[PDB]
Amino acid sequence: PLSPPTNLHLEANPDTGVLTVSWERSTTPDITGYRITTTPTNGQQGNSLEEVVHADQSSCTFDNLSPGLEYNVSVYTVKDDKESVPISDTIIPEVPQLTDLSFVDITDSSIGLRWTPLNSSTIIGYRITVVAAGEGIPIFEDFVDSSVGYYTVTGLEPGIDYDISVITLINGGESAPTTLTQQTAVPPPTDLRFTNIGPDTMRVTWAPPPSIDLTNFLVRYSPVKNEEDVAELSISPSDNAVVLTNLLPGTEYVVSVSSVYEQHESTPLRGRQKT
Amino acid sequence: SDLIPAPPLSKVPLQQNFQDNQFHGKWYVVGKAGNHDLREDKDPRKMQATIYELKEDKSYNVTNVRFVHKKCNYRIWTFVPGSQPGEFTLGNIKSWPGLTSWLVRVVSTNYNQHAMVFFKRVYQNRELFEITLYGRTKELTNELKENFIRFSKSLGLPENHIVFPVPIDQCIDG
């Protein structure tokens, strides 16, 4: 008989939407080519496709199969007007996941999300989940339609890591989750102030971030000329000022104040002052 | 980072003949113990409240209430009845990526005074568990608090993993 193909392999790439069918070529010496078919196993869903390749080829592609449907794939060895018994297998192509989820407009209580909505016509929406990374506590869940690629998560706490996921949805299935960790901002102090200036000392003052309970403030300072010479002070969250001692006369210093919650610190508030 | 292994469930009893309609309402968090390392902020912990609303489908609308960073913070979960009365899991657990397991079990209560609740979950292949001593008021008997300590220790948790939060007035009453 005409010997069928062997070693049938089916690879559905969800990012490209393409099914690649491969096989080991027939042992029969003088063949025309191969005929490959695509047939949904659920008789109420999808439709059939057919592909044809040359005798020296051992793969073919099919695009625009429906994610989440089961398909029987058959490969037939072709010899003029004659065909081998097929080799067959089933595959369920995955739902595509988002590949460019990014974060934007990060604040102390809010996180903005952006992504490119996928171009797959059976996608009917996205699921957004927000989980507190430290404890695995679910925080928030919502749904957006298939054409939306933006979302603002609100009502969060500052200085906290959140696992944020966007899952692509079809009727009756979903993609693997696109999950990323994003920390909420620790709010910086504002309005750096320098008073009581002497040869060796200076009073550093700032405005605390409102309505937050910091672990501490963290004061860093170093000479402008040699900036690898950094000293570090830990200040109580209830204090808005510190007196810096043991300084050099006629010298310009860079000073930063950073809010700190649970080891996570704010962007620095920075200013220069000359003794 | 490091975790005390979860106790086998043979070690966690279940309140017999649990009455969902009597567990209903506000419970204050008088004591709590967990398997995660506790960082001390240079601050004692403030008391929280947890409200269990019973629904027509016999599930609970659970609302945790906290006074953190000078605001009121609310968090809501849906607890659905597990295999037995007194047991609960999370409605729609397959909604949450990486969260593969979630168990709540009412260890013991008298409904009008005190409760001990055991929570277990697996998130991203890490097993976390807690025990809460709940009270109908903000304070409980020494005997009861001692009982909770004794029970927590029986689950493998050391003394210093146990906290009794300080009673406060913000958020939790209103």
Where in chain B are the domains? Answer: 1-174
| CA separation for the pair A40, A49 (Å, rounded) | 10
A234 in Cβ contact with A218 (< 8 Å): yes
Q: What are phi and psi of A113, to 5 degrees?
A: -120, 145
Strand partners, B109: B115
Show residues of chain B in contact with A136, CB under 8 Å: 98-99, 121-124, 126, 128
Name which of B41, B71, B126 is nearest A215 (Cβ-Cβ): B41
Strand partners, A202: A244
Q: Which H or E run includes A150? A: strand A150-153
CATH of domain B1-174: 2.40.128.20
3 state SS of B103:
strand
3 state SS of A55:
coil
3 state SS of A231:
strand
Residue in the block written with tokens 């209560």: B109
Tell me the one-letter amino acid at B52: Y
3 state SS of B68:
strand
Tell me the one-letter amino acid at A270: R
User: Where along chain A do its domains lie?
Assistant: 1-93, 94-186, 187-275
Q: Which of A132, A177, A181 is nearest to B121 (CA)?
A: A132
| CA separation for the pair A167, A170 (Å, rounded) | 10
Show residues of chain A in contact with B77, CB under 8 Å: 138
Q: Is B55 on the interface with A (CB under 8 A)?
A: no
Interface with chain B: mutation pick from A108, A127, A142, A163, highest number of B CBs within 10 Å = A163
Distance from CA of B8 to the nearest CA of A (A): 21
Angle at B130 (CA atoms; ends B87, B30), nearest 5 degrees? 95
Give the DSSP letter of residue A26.
P
Here the tokens at position A91 are 């595959």
Residue in the block written with tokens 């309505």: A211
Q: Which CATH architecture has domain A187-275?
A: Sandwich (2.60)
What are the Cα distances from residue A194, in Å, to A15, A232, A275, B172? 56, 18, 10, 42
What is the residue-wise DSSP string for A105-148?
S--SS-EEEE------TT--EEEEEEEETTTTEEEEEEEE-TT-
B56 in Cβ contact with B71 (< 8 Å): no
3 state SS of B145:
helix
Q: Is B75 on the interface with A (CB under 8 A)?
A: yes
Test A131 with B39 for CB contact under 8 angstroms.
Answer: no
Strands, E, within chain B: which ranges?
25-34, 49-54, 60-68, 71-81, 87-90, 99-109, 114-123, 126-135, 162-163
3 state SS of B154:
helix
Q: Which of B168, B159, B117, B160 is nearest to B139 (CA)?
A: B168
Name which of A136, A165, A213 is nearest B128 (Cβ-Cβ): A136
3 state SS of A99:
coil
CB atoms within 10 A of CB A209: 19
3 state SS of A12:
strand
Name the method of structure determination: X-ray
| CA separation for the pair A153, B48 (Å, rounded) | 24
Buried b / exposed e across B112-127, counting CB within 10 Å, b at 16+?
eebbbbbbbbbbeeee
Test A158 with B69 for CB contact under 8 angstroms.
Answer: yes
Here the tokens at position B65 are 């209430």
Q: Which of A235, A262, A251, A241 is nearest to A191 (CA)?
A: A241
Name which of A129, A211, A212 is nearest B96 (Cβ-Cβ): A129
Q: Which H or E run includes A87? A: strand A87-91
Q: Is B46 on the interface with A (CB under 8 A)?
A: no
| CA separation for the pair A186, A213 (Å, rounded) | 10
| CA separation for the pair A257, A218 (Å, rounded) | 6
Q: Which of A72, A119, A75 is nearest to A93 (CA)?
A: A72
Strand partners, A264: A261
- Which chain A residues touch B if contact means CB-CB below 8 Å? 127, 129, 131, 135-139, 141, 157-158, 163, 165, 167, 177, 179, 211-213, 215, 262
* Backbone φ/ψ region at B42: left (φ over 0), alpha (ψ -120 to 50), beta: left
The resolution in Å comes to 2.6
Q: Which long-range CB contacts under 8 A does B163-167 form with residues at least 24 apart?
A: B163/B31, B163/B32, B163/B33, B163/B38, B163/B45, B164/B30, B164/B31, B165/B29, B165/B30, B165/B31, B165/B32, B165/B44, B165/B45, B165/B46, B165/B47, B165/B48, B166/B44, B166/B45, B166/B46, B166/B47, B167/B47, B167/B138, B167/B139
Test B95 with A163 for CB contact under 8 angstroms.
Answer: no
CATH of domain A94-186: 2.60.40.10
| CA separation for the pair B48, B51 (Å, rounded) | 10
Give the DSSP letter of residue B167.
P
Burial of B144 (0-12, 13-18, 19+ CB in 10 A): middle
Q: Is B117 on the interface with A (CB under 8 A)?
A: no
What are the Cα distances from residue A40, in Å, to A11, A53, A251? 16, 21, 79
| CA separation for the pair A224, A202 (Å, rounded) | 16
Interface with chain A: mutation pick from B66, B79, B96, highest number of A CBs within 10 Å = B96
Here the tokens at position A225 are 């000329």
Test A129 with B124 for CB contact under 8 angstroms.
Answer: no
B70 in Cβ contact with A211 (< 8 Å): yes
Test A131 with B41 for CB contact under 8 angstroms.
Answer: no
Q: Is B128 on the interface with A (CB under 8 A)?
A: yes
| CA separation for the pair A138, B95 (Å, rounded) | 10
A113 in Cβ contact with A140 (< 8 Å): no
Question: Greatest CA span in chain A, whole angstroms?
Answer: 102
A177 in Cβ contact with A221 (< 8 Å): no
Show residues of chain A in contact with B98, CB under 8 Å: 131, 136, 163, 177, 179
Q: Is B18 on the interface with A (CB under 8 A)?
A: no
Distance from CA of B75 to the nearest CA of A (A): 7
CATH of domain A1-93: 2.60.40.10
What is the residue-wise DSSP string for A163-227?
EEEEEEEETTEEPPPEEEEEEPPPPPPEEEEEES--SS-EEEEEEPPSS---SEEEEEEEESS-T
| CA separation for the pair A207, A256 (Å, rounded) | 13
A121 in Cβ contact with A69 (< 8 Å): no
Closest chain B CA to residue A138: B96
Q: Which H or E run includes A88? A: strand A87-91
| CA separation for the pair A119, A140 (Å, rounded) | 26
| CA separation for the pair B112, B145 (Å, rounded) | 16
A149 in Cβ contact with A115 (< 8 Å): yes
Contacts of A94 (CB under 8 A, 6+ apart): A12, A14, A67, A68, A175, A176
Q: Which of B124, B126, B122 is nearest to B103 (CA)?
A: B122
Contacts of B4 (CB under 8 A, 6+ apart): B35, B156, B157, B158, B161
Here the tokens at position A57 are 């080829």
Q: Is B100 on the interface with A (CB under 8 A)?
A: no
B170 in Cβ contact with B73 (< 8 Å): no
Strands B126-135 and B114-123: antiparallel
A155 in Cβ contact with A109 (< 8 Å): yes
Question: Greatest CA span in chain B, whole angstroms?
Answer: 44
